[PDB]
Design a protein around this ligand. Structure first.
Ligand SMILES: Nc1ncnc2c1ncn2[C@@H]1O[C@H](COP(=O)(O)OP(=O)(O)OP(=O)(O)O)[C@@H](O)[C@H]1O
Ligand SMILES: Nc1ncnc2c1ncn2[C@@H]1O[C@H](COP(=O)(O)OP(=O)(O)OP(=O)(O)O)[C@@H](O)[C@H]1O
Ligand SMILES: Nc1ncnc2c1ncn2[C@@H]1O[C@H](COP(=O)(O)OP(=O)(O)OP(=O)(O)O)[C@@H](O)[C@H]1O
Ligand SMILES: Nc1ncnc2c1ncn2[C@@H]1O[C@H](COP(=O)(O)OP(=O)(O)OP(=O)(O)O)[C@@H](O)[C@H]1O
Ligand SMILES: Nc1ncnc2c1ncn2[C@@H]1O[C@H](COP(=O)(O)OP(=O)(O)OP(=O)(O)O)[C@@H](O)[C@H]1O
Ligand SMILES: Nc1ncnc2c1ncn2[C@@H]1O[C@H](COP(=O)(O)OP(=O)(O)OP(=O)(O)O)[C@@H](O)[C@H]1O
Ligand SMILES: Nc1ncnc2c1ncn2[C@@H]1O[C@H](COP(=O)(O)OP(=O)(O)OP(=O)(O)O)[C@@H](O)[C@H]1O
Ligand SMILES: [Mg+2]
Ligand SMILES: [Mg+2]
Ligand SMILES: [Mg+2]
Ligand SMILES: [Mg+2]
Ligand SMILES: [Mg+2]
Ligand SMILES: [Mg+2]
Lengths: 449, 453, 453
């Protein structure tokens, strides 16, 4: 079976090409999931890319409202209708023949129906029979159609009468689950008759572009901002690598992030600092307190600061922003301060995927990523440390009633690193890595000898 | 699609502007969620700000009742027929035609219908859909932004009664009132906005004398004194003006003491302060304050200190936030303290507590108010599981230390964001004057968990 | 009761032979479970192996579609009317009579009906039962082993749609497709087999180009080298050929290094090997390998090493197993490594992970393939909760050791099943050549948890 591209970012990979040609596809989901958006975007892209005439069978929504709503993404459906490319059919064997003629009147390939469930009020026994009749008249014609149906529950019947999925050849379930009052959009392909696909749900978002489903290794080294740090890292971090600075609160993660972001702008290199714990106002003072003019770096258009709240948006939304902001600014290195923030009030599963997407994309675009993590045992994991290539752990050490702090390169993939827990201290200039605690024994968890 | 501002505190941000123009919005919820309230505000603010004519369609409730009910907030019905700003239609093509006539009669587009499910008792979903769809078609044809009100049965069940009303509507706003732990929590959510964008997921709101109060989601180097001199010296000069300080420790360490001195220092410099107590009562606070050499009555007599003690399980976290909001907005203090956060987290979801901290933290820094929140650590004589220490800019840790069968206590500035601080665990003592920070324990080591050597 | 083989990989074991002769079997499941697939295989294998005539009864799906759909696996419809092996009947005593005629017309007993619930839209359970019972009575009277296909609504709800179809049928096979953690898992179960025995409970299966692939549930003293000489010496000569080795430790200890040397040693002796990566990517693997003095490209150039990296949350555990199965069956390696097991357990049920380990372990020993699985221990600088250490024959434990403010690491052969091994915790170091095992820590003691003395 041949598949038709939908040009929906992610769907082509999940569907292994796209939607089956000749056959119809069902798109079930609750209200506000994006059944119509998919429906329109399926057509829009069909005529904008492959020049294939498509027809939209409306029902409870009018042709004008469709265009008006579609103009949110900058899609001039009117111009497409003005060229006779997209035919909006206003609105059960009458419509069947009314839709059959239209397809031929334009010499069609793709068709969208939003929604069949709208034309089944009067009429589960009859639904199937009439539903099966429609699918048959489309397959016979040979036009790839996307059918929209509506669901009551996110984890319940596939359609409304629990029959539309069985009559349909392909089933795509759009979800919108509310876990901890957050709301997360996920799309899934339940089945594809006569072809393979990716199973299970996948995080997606809706932006001014539409649906956005998210399904070398150079030996070049870069600097972290700290000379000794580069020295104990065996010459510095790798360009296409993910570094992680984990420690207790007030150890100096944000300090290292600042110097790491600074060092970029010290060599005409663009950088992004994704704040999640502090605001720009506060970050500016702290930076200047450490002898770094962040305001200047924003004036050189080398540093970009994006601050936001981890509980404000979803993880799938946080990822899109990162991507968009990365795609626009095109930084040399990014930093997320911090991951532990993007984790609170989130399913461990949904967080892992987030970490994979960011790291995966950070290395796909060859960007040095410095993510920080706050340890939950201050002066005292979730297995995201196996994604990071380098690990810089900061830990305090109670010494003679004086609360000090130490630094150590826990690991360094494909490179030598210093295996010593050096003590360091923070001043108005920045960090200063001194010697290691040769006397203090067993300082891995504190209480040194 | 343009948006019309509803002037409902918080909603204008969650909707990214407001409600779409010439479009029908649904507002489903259980009984007592605040559908009518929202419905009224939409109109009230319409003609009471933008002079935008608007008509309210009643059904189960009488005009007189509505007018009387809305007097709880202070909204008079002198804009009804005593100005021609409102249009209460007492109560399917008959009503529509009347509504269509009233619109142009008053020359308006702001409409509020409450309730719609009540006018479907003559039937029992197909008929609802058909009739419901015709209504939105009519209204959209006139081009009047209408707010429709539907009722639900479950907080986490069907959007509307017949599981269809949301599919016909262009906009869906779900008002909730979840009961978790014998405590109610009002949350509003925008499910979808056809043709535009919005914030996703639920947002905590409250109903007060103002009405609905939704809760959506610089940097000076000026230093302020904490009350204690030595503490200011170990903080490298003192706390920051627009900063949040946290004093954690076991029970009976001295958090309430530090708070007293912190608030005292305000009133001493002729600056207003608020003390939000949650563990002790004013009666007891005055008694302990004076025991340390602080006249809280004197401070209350100068109108520089306000005490607001209450039980952390008597109201929801959103209700506590609103109280803090109003008390701050009214008194306009230089610095506020919460004693304690831990007392507000008990019998609360970690999700709801985080949002509360963010809101209070955010608002404290937005008004440039020095904040001192306290928290009682679980381990008494022997971590901070909750991840609220990354929000606090300063952390003052108090810890007990057993020394030769003598229960002593130690203080330390754990961290100071964007400032040098002392890195020593000094021993401190409490007397009839206040805290006396002394020297650190250079002999006995490893007092992170207590019991050094 | 005799059984007829279905030639479906795994099913013949779970059914203790196959499907009962002259008896009606039910196959209920939700949409996309693989009912039609199973239905087709039953016939396809019938005439494509045992030359046993068989007729397929369609209903909602057209013959042309079925033929086209089954071309995803490579099954042609040249056995239909171009040989007379198949008999697709396009579509209650009328059909039965036709089915009865076709049977003797083709002289067969292999029948597949998909779907039956679709021919009950004219009604809405009593009628279903009565009509359904008459069908099994007819078919049993002809003595033709039929496979009936029904649809369900819930994975853990009624067996069939009307909660009756299972009671009329003699055999019940429930195809499931559970969604746990946004990941789908196909499981087939034989509920009952009237008159015979079978395996109880669900069994993981997958659908591939071959079709359905169900997963049901010697000893040489030949030694192989691990890559490292000293390691072979502490293993009493080296690992066993048909054995499973596990290398546990914190992150950045040297598990991936050992794997590289283990796989290197294979290709060095002109033996094929597969490296199933799950934590790093090929790009990065090549970079780190060469840093240790190993040319993985060279090994790939010799066609002795195959790298198969993928994300452990991109597919189900059963899907990962099938991939390992095919990759092994194709390449036919001397030794395979999985880096790592721990990465495959995250976001997975302990039940599903055990079965995965068993299958991979079992298949590795069944083909006499030396296996090296790695696992990252939770405690970093500071047990193995999962009970997968009793399956591994060898255990190579790597542990960090803090020595005078210097993060060193130690290696030890924790155990060696049916072989002498070294019982010393030797310190080891990583350089630009590989692992250098040295002497043990006779001074510093109690490095089980780390931080000796
Ligand atoms: N070549 C293939 N590779 C992988 N998976 C495939 C392939 N061909 C089919 N499939 C899988 O088989 C599924 C369809 O199987 P089948 O048609 O038997 O389902 P079903 O349960 O009978 O569906 P329905 O209840 O809708 O009739 C697809 O969703 C797909 O996941
Ligand atoms: N002045 C006030 N102060 C505090 N809360 C108030 C005040 N006036 C009204 N309320 C709250 O508003 C609620 C009623 O709001 P409203 O009448 O909009 O509810 P509703 O959801 O429309 O109810 P129903 O579904 O029964 O019509 C009361 O239960 C009360 O909690
Ligand atoms: N310009 C935009 N930017 C961002 N998000 C948008 C934008 N336009 C729409 N959206 C989002 O997408 C949704 C529109 O989806 P759509 O109208 O297709 O929903 P639907 O599932 O078809 O709803 P219904 O079942 O009620 O017809 C909006 O509610 C909003 O959440
Ligand atoms: N007049 C006094 N003289 C000496 N010590 C006093 C006096 N009044 C109080 N204290 C000391 O102060 C302690 C209580 O201080 P405070 O109430 O500030 O502590 P806390 O840690 O906030 O307590 P809780 O967690 O119970 O609210 C007493 O246990 C006692 O040791
Ligand atoms: N100007 C300064 N002079 C000296 N030390 C400073 C200065 N500014 C900050 N510090 C030190 O650095 C610490 C803050 O560093 P940073 O904010 O990077 O830590 P962090 O571990 O990222 O904290 P958090 O977990 O709260 O984000 C302060 O607690 C203090 O000890
Ligand atoms: N020889 C055997 N050895 C082992 N187990 C057997 C044997 N024969 C039958 N069984 C088991 O017992 C079951 C037979 O039970 P039985 O036919 O009484 O079920 P039932 O509850 O009456 O079913 P129904 O409700 O469909 O009539 C088989 O499905 C199988 O699990
Ligand atoms: N060229 C090199 N020279 C010296 N040491 C090196 C070199 N390359 C890597 N290392 C060491 O090897 C370690 C990583 O080894 P490896 O990746 O095998 O460990 P691992 O325990 O499998 O790690 P992970 O759990 O992160 O996958 C580094 O932390 C470093 O100490
Ligand atoms: Mg729609
Ligand atoms: Mg920080
Ligand atoms: Mg009301
Ligand atoms: Mg107290
Ligand atoms: Mg089928
Ligand atoms: Mg490794």
């Amino acid at each position: 079976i041949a598949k038709m591209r939908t040009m929906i970012e992610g769907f082509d990979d999940i569907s292994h090409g796209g939607l089956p040609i000749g056959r119809s596809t069902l798109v079930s989901g609750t209200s506000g999931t994006g059944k119509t958006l998919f429906s329109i975007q399926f057509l829009y892209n069909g005529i904008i890319e492959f020049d294939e005439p498509g027809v939209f069978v409306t029902f409870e929504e009018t042709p004008q409202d469709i265009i008006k709503n579609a103009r949110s993404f900058g899609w001039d459906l009117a111009k497409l209708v003005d060229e006779g490319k997209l035919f909006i059919l206003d609105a059960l064997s009458a419509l069947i023949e009314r839709i059959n003629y239209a397809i031929q009147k334009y010499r069609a390939r793709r068709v969208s129906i939003d929604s069949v469930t709208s034309v089944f009020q009067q009429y589960s026994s009859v639904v199937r029979r009439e539903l099966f009749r429609l699918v048959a008249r489309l397959k016979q014609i040979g036009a790839t159609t996307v059918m929209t149906t509506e669901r009551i529950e996110e984890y319940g019947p596939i359609a409304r009468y629990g029959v539309e999925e069985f009559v349909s050849d392909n089933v795509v379930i759009l979800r919108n689950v509310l876990e901890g009052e957050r709301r997360r959009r996920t799309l899934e392909i339940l089945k594809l008759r006569g072809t393979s696909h990716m199973k299970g749900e996948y995080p997606f978002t809706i932006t001014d572009h539409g649906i956005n489903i998210f399904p070398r290794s150079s030996n070049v080294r870069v600097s972290s901002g700290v000379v000794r740090l580069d020295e104990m890292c065996g010459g510095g971090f790798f360009k296409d690598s993910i570094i992680l600075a984990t420690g207790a609160t007030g150890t100096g993660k944000t300090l290292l992030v600042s110097r790491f972001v600074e060092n970029a702008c010290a060599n005409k290199e663009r950088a992004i600092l994704f704040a999640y714990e502090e605001s720009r106002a506060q970050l500016l003072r702290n930076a200047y307190s450490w002898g770094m003019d962040f305001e200047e770096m924003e004036r050189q258009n080398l540093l970009k600061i994006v601050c936001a709240y981890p509980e404000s948006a979803g993880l799938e939304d946080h990822l899109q922003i990162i991507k968009s902001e990365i795609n626009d600014f095109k930084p040399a290195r990014i930093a997320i301060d911090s991951l532990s923030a993007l984790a609170r009030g989130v399913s461990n599963n949904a967080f892992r995927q987030f970490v994979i997407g960011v790291t995966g994309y950070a290395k796909q675009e060859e960007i040095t990523g410095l993510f920080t993590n706050t340890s939950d045992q201050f002066m005292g994991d979730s297995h995201i440390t196996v994604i990071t290539d380098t690990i810089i752990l900061l830990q305090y050490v109670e010494i003679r009633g004086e609360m000090s702090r130490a630094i150590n390169v826990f690991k360094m993939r494909g490179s030598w690193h210093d295996k010593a827990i050096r003590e360091f201290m923070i001043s108005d200039k920045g960090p200063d890595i001194k010697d290691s605690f040769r006397n203090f024994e067993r300082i891995i968890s504190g209480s040194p000898t």
